[PDB]
């Protein structure tokens, strides 16, 4: 639903990188270069930005008030 704070296998902090990953994919960069531009060398931490689904947006669509 939301980006984890650390990689399950390794433990490197990946929570502070989803927004930056989206921005780098936004500008011109593609995934294969964005991942190593962010600083993810091991393949275990790269699933956190590829396999993650961002379901918090749909949840936020159901605003309680206003």
């Amino acid at each position: 639903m939301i980006i984890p704070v650390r990689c399950f296998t390794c433990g490197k902090i990946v929570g502070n990188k989803w927004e930056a990953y989206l921005g780098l994919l936004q500008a011109e960069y593609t995934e294969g270069d964005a991942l190593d531009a962010l600083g993810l060398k091991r393949y275990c931490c790269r699933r956190m930005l590829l396999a993650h689904v961002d379901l918090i947006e749909k949840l936020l669509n159901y605003a309680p008030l206003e």
């Binding site: 936004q26 947006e57 605003a63 008030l65």
Partner: protein, 71 residues
């Protein structure tokens, strides 16, 4: 007495108000009443779209943009 003065669109009844207006328009066979109901529904839809755009200006819109360019 509360809803008499209290304006209706606020806040979560936007879909309910739109459905009620559409039902009233369909039920009413008159021309002026149907036109007024259609205009009210269009105004409510525009207000809802503007409110969503203001709320979804960041993140919710950028994620759509990145998804569309990625596909």
């Amino acid at each position: 007495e509360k809803e008499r003065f209290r304006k209706a669109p606020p806040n979560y009844a936007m879909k309910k108000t739109q459905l009620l207006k559409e039902k009233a328009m369909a039920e009413d066979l008159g021309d002026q009443d149907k036109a007024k109901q259609i205009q009210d529904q269009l105004n409510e839809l525009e207000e809802r779209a503007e409110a969503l755009d203001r709320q979804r200006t960041k993140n919710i819109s950028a994620i759509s943009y990145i998804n569309q360019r990625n596909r």
